[PDB]
A paper describes a structure:
The [name] from [name] exhibits high TH activity and relatively strong recrystallization inhibition activity. The [name] structure is composed of parallel β-strands in a helical pattern, which is mainly stabilized by inner hydrophobic interactions and intramolecular hydrogen bonds with long α415. Additionally, the [name] has a capping head region that consists of two small turns and β-strands, which contain a disulfide bond. This disulfide bond increases the overall rigidity of the protein and reduces residual movement at the ice-binding site, thereby augmenting TH activity and protein stability.
Based on the CD and MD simulation data, four mutants annotated as [name]_CC1 (A101C-A120C), [name]_CC2 (S96C-L132C), [name]_CC3 ([name]-[name]), and [name]_CC4 (G160C-S176C), possibly forming disulfide bonds, were generated. The formation of the disulfide bond at [name]_CC3 is anticipated to increase the stability of the global structure as the hyperactive IBPs contain disulfide bond(s) for the intra-interaction inside of the body domain. Therefore, we generated the [name]_CC3, which was located in the internal body domain. To confirm the disulfide formation, we solved the crystal structures of the [name]_CC1, CC2, CC3, and CC4 at 2.0, 2.1, 2.0, and 2.0 Å, respectively. Successful formation of the disulfide bond at the intended location in [name]_CC1 and [name]_CC4 was confirmed by X-ray crystallography, whereas the rest did not form a disulfide bond. The failure to form a disulfide bond may be due to dihedral angle constraints and the inappropriate distance between the two cysteines. When the RMSD values of alpha carbon mutants were compared with the wildtype, relatively high RMSD values exceeding 0.4 Å were observed around the mutation sites of [name]_CC2, [name]_CC3, and [name]_CC4. [name]_CC3 exhibited a ΔTm of − 0.8 °C compared to the wildtype, which is consistent with the hypothesis that the body region is heat-insensitive.
Residue numbers in the entry: 61 to 276
Amino acid sequence: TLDLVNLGVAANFAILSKTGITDVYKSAITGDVGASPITGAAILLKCDEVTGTIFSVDAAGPACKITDASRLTTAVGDMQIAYDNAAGRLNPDFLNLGAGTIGGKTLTPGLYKWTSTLNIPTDITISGSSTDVWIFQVAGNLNMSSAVRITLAGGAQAKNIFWQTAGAVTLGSTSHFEGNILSQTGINCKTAASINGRMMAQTAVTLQMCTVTIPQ
């Protein structure tokens, strides 16, 4: 059975990036947000958008920000370890499933690999027990189209799902995502996209009136 990706301190964040967090007001974030090593000024969230703590490396950032460089250093470090752990898993259960387009699929537990961009143009289901683990390894971009919903079935939980992407993630407007995103690059959410899962970007997270909730 497939081991969890250990996020270490990064587990405490709904959104963690390296070059900031942009926003089209109003978004709804539940969980802590942070960015390092970029200045807190690069977090463009207001205080009324975040239920949780906004962490900054410095004296800049939103009014409510807490300055904690040392915690953000560990979190981003942990996020990179998680990214490398997820990317490094061997012996996939699936390689190039749906030739890189997986709309309408029900995904069962295990390790999936794509040597391409992964596209999700229509609704999918992720189906398994409360303790089953999914790791999706994507060597290109990850695209989910407008209005596309990931459904969890069988007791599958968002905290047991990891999406590792070598390229940028693009969540289409009104889309509903489930799981942790470990992006080597950006995570770009469009108007009124929901994410039940963490957005861990080694560049930036961009929001457009999005809802982000840390998985429970």
